[PDB]
């Protein structure tokens, strides 16, 4: 009859997944985050002074706090419906980077350079993003082994 309160429902979430227990790495005690370096909020089991509570874990956010050994985030969570902002304070080793910006920054500097090579011939930019297309119309020699090549099933009886 309960959630209500403060750490219930942490079966596979809040601990350490397999073969990573014990002493923390020291890479994540080194990282640096400016204002606007978009970052994630996730779970941990090796700094037991601080957590993001039962709903947040698995969400990412902006950073507008720079402090002693903490990070204060903006994050969106579902109320019904007034989806608000929330300011959560947390010690740093709960937190991983976004890599979702980390494709986009090399989407920038290619476009500053591929326009820069375009600045000698003019046409054309072609600088937006497009997924795969309907391709072509080949003609295909066998070339490699003419047809039939006939796999027809018969397998049930066992």
């Amino acid at each position: 009859t309960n959630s209500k309160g403060y750490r219930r429902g942490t079966r596979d979430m809040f601990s350490r997944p397999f073969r990573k227990h014990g002493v923390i790495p020291l890479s994540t005690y080194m990282r640096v985050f400016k204002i606007g370096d978009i970052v994630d909020i996730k779970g941990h089991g090796a700094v037991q002074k601080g957590l993001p509570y039962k709903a947040y874990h698995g969400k990412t956010g902006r950073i507008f706090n720079v402090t002693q050994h903490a990070v204060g985030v903006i994050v969106n969570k579902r109320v019904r419906g007034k989806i608000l902002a929330k300011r959560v304070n947390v010690r740093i080793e709960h937190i991983h980077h976004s890599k979702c910006r980390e494709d986009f920054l090399r989407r920038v500097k290619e476009n500053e350079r591929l326009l820069k090579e375009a600045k000698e011939k003019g046409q054309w930019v072609s600088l937006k993003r497009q997924p795969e297309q309907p391709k072509k119309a080949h003609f295909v020699k066998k070339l490699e082994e003419p047809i039939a090549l006939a796999p027809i099933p018969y397998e049930f009886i066992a």
Binding site: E132, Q133, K135
Partner: protein, 56 residues
């Protein structure tokens, strides 16, 4: 073996009502401007509209 070209330029005509429609197929279908029965528009095909076209 000469393949034909697999094509762009589809054309999409609604078939079924306004009602008894699935949850997130209500926003996709207002996102092609098919609303009434037997209305149609065209698309520019790629993968990025197939998995909009598949969810209707």
């Amino acid at each position: 073996f000469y393949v034909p070209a697999e094509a762009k330029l589809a054309f999409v005509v609604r078939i079924r009502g306004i009602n008894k429609v699935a949850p997130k197929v209500r926003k996709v279908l207002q996102l092609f401007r098919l609303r009434q029965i037997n209305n149609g528009v065209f698309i520019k095909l790629n993968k990025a509209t197939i998995n909009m076209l598949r969810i209707a």
